[PDB]
């Protein structure tokens, strides 16, 4: 480590903790930066020298963490808990919490290479035919639009067998050093580490209480969209009392259905909700997208993206055919300068929402660049999933599709109004199960609870057991089903997007009232509200100095999460899928749980 990089000396007490945190802070801000760009080079220009440059700065990021870690468990390790600042409690007990730079040297490096091969194994796979589909744009344009059971049935199992099975070798292997790592800092498994972001002592009972509020909204959602798929695939492929296959749900993971749309719709005689032919119609290129969103930010008074922003950042997929990661995210270089999203952005009102997700990511960057390195968080890291959907919940109301020349009919009627809040569920509600069951299984994984030898048959428990979906093909332990996950081999959490999923309604609610808006809560617009700003840019400039709890008190008037206003802002269409589902004779849930569908009679 740089002797520049290296701490010094600092008095074994509260006082000295507080000239030990704020040195400390000075340094790791230089060393995020280089981690950072050696990622981003690597992750828009995918090189096996790339790869090494990424591996040898976190091998340095990791010396500076022991270095530092050492210095405050040889300070402070006996007294720091009772110290009498909170922050410092904190700024600094992270400190104290060495991660991966528990591990000795030969593990360390055997780490960090197992985290590259893994991403660089998700990011390059390849579905063959000998051409080659990629995951974005190909199979994912083949999931959203192709209505062949059979074409989608190859592009499912294609992308599960390339990304997944080469995974697994490697999975167990990380698995196993980040609970060697993390149990050295007091921790029983990496998956506890991850839960203590969150400060709350019953997070996963709280959570378990919050899905049992939704489940009902799922179930009703499931077995409609179950009955319109039945009406187009027949009675071979969809079992009206059984899972939904896997792969009919427009989406990769079936994680988001609003894809199919046009198969639910209850009214299609009202304006099309869904613009993305309307976007293609005009002409709408990534870097218009991004501008769109830029000005609902600044409508609200809220910060421009910098011209290092939109210099550096890599906003569609590169055509001289180099290799990228896809997945789109969003960058801060910890340099107080340099923030960038990375997507292939295509043309679709989805990826319109995506873009906004990433800017709320930029735009929390931008407000809270000016706190300790240590405070550049979310209040937890759901707050940080909520803000740019937060937006997107505006955005995609008819009416303000209307002012950016997406509709041209705006119409305000109980049938428009359902035909909304479908959509809205196919994207939201859909989404709740999985977005709550992919750490579920990751916390089994590192608890133990999960050895490879059940990695996926745990995995298809949960997919069945909350979302009720089957796959379409026969899988066995040689498969690894989670592994064509991005997050699971690029290792970043998941039950963040649940709670964003949550908190972002009550959000909304709250800067929906604070911009004086009066009507029912689908079809506020905060943009152009300077207030509503105002109350967004507190929880933003806030970064992680205060607990998330009183963050939320202060901007939505509860201290914790809380399912009715997404159940408020859904009220209509939950009453009315209930009362269609009634009228159908459907059967809520999937009884038929063994269920899968056969094969196509020449599959492939
Ligand atoms: C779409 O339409 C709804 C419904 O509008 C109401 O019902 C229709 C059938 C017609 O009778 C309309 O003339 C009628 O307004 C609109 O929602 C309504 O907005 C008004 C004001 O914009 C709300 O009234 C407010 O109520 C608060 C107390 O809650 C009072 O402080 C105020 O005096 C204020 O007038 C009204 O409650 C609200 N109704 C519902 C269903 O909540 C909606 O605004 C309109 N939206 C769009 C996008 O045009
Ligand atoms: C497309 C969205 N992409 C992610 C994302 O932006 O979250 C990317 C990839 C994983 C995290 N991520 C980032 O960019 C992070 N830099 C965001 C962040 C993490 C910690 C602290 C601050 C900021 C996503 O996966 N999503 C979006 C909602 C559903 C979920 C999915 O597609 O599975
Ligand atoms: C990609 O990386 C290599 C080194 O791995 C570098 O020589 C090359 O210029 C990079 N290409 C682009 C277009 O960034
Ligand atoms: C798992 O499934 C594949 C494809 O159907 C098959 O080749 C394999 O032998 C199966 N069994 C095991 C133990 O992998
Ligand atoms: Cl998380
Ligand atoms: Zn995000």
Redesign the pocket.
């Known amino acids: 480590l740089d002797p520049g990089l290296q701490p010094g000396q600092f008095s074994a007490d509260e006082a000295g903790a507080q000239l030990f945190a704020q040195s400390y802070q000075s340094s790791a801000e230089q060393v995020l930066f280089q981690s950072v760009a050696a990622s981003w080079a690597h992750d828009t220009n995918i090189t096996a020298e790339n790869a090494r440059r990424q591996e040898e700065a976190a091998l340095l990021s990791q010396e500076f963490a022991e270095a530092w870690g050492q210095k405050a468990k040889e300070l402070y390790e006996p007294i720091w808990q009772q110290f009498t600042d909170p922050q410092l409690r904190r700024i600094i007990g992270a400190v104290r919490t060495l991660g991966s730079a528990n591990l000795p040297l030969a593990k360390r490096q055997q780490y960090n290479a197992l985290l590259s091969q893994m991403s660089r194994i998700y990011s390059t796979a390849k579905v063959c035919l000998a051409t080659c589909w990629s995951l974005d744009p190909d199979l994912t344009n083949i999931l959203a639009s192709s209505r062949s059971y059979a074409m989608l049935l190859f592009a499912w199992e294609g992308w599960h067998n390339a990304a997944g099975i080469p995974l697994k070798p490697l999975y167990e292997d990380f698995t196993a050093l980040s609970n060697e790592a993390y149990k050295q800092d007091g921790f029983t498994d990496t998956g506890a580490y991850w839960r203590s972001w969150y400060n709350s002592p019953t997070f996963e009972d709280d959570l378990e209480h919050l899905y049992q509020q939704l489940e009902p909204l799922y179930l009703n959602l499931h077995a409609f969209v179950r009955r319109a798929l039945h009406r187009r695939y027949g009675d071979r492929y969809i079992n009206l009392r059984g899972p939904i296959p896997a792969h009919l749900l427009g989406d990769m993971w079936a994680q988001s259905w609003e894809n199919i749309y046009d198969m639910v719709v209850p009214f299609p005689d009202k304006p099309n909700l869904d613009v993305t032919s309307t976007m293609l119609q005009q002409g709408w290129q990534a870097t218009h997208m991004f501008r769109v969103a830029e000005e609902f930010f600044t409508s609200l008074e809220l910060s421009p993206m910098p011209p290092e922003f939109w210099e550096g950042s890599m906003l569609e997929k590169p055509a001289d055919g180099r290799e990228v990661v896809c997945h789109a995210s969003a960058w801060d270089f910890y340099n107080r300068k340099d923030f960038r999203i990375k997507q292939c952005t295509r043309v679709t009102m989805d990826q319109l929402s995506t873009v906004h997700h990433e800017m709320g990511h930029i735009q929390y960057y931008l407000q809270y660049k000016d706190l300790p390195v240590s405070l550049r968080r979310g209040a937890n890291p759901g707050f940080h999933e909520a803000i740019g959907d937060v937006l997107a919940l505006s955005v995609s109301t008819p009416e303000h599709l209307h002012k950016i020349g997406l509709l041209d009919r705006v119409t305000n009627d109980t049938e428009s109004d359902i035909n909304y809040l479908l959509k809205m569920a196919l994207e939201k509600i859909a989404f709740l199960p999985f977005g709550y069951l992919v750490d579920q299984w990751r916390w089994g994984v590192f608890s133990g609870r999960t050895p490879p030898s059940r990695y996926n048959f745990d995995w298809w428990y949960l997919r069945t057991k909350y979302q009720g979906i089957c796959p379409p ?7 690894f089903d989670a592994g064509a996950k991005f997050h699971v081999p690029n290792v970043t959490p998941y039950i963040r997007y649940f709670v964003s999923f949550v908190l972002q309604f009550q959000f909304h609610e709250a800067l929906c009232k604070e911009a004086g808006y009066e009507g029912p809560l689908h079809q506020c617009d905060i943009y152009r509200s300077t207030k509503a700003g105002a109350k967004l840019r507190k929880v933003l400039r806030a970064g992680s100095s205060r607990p998330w709890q009183e963050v939320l008190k202060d901007m939505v008037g509860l201290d914790a999460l809380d399912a009715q206003p997404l159940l408020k802002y859904f009220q209509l269409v939950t009453q009315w899928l209930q009362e269609q589902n009634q009228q159908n004779g459907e059967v809520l849930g999937w009884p038929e749980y063994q269920w899968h569908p056969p094969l196509p009679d020449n599959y492939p």
């Open positions: 093909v026969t899988r066995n332990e040689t498969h």
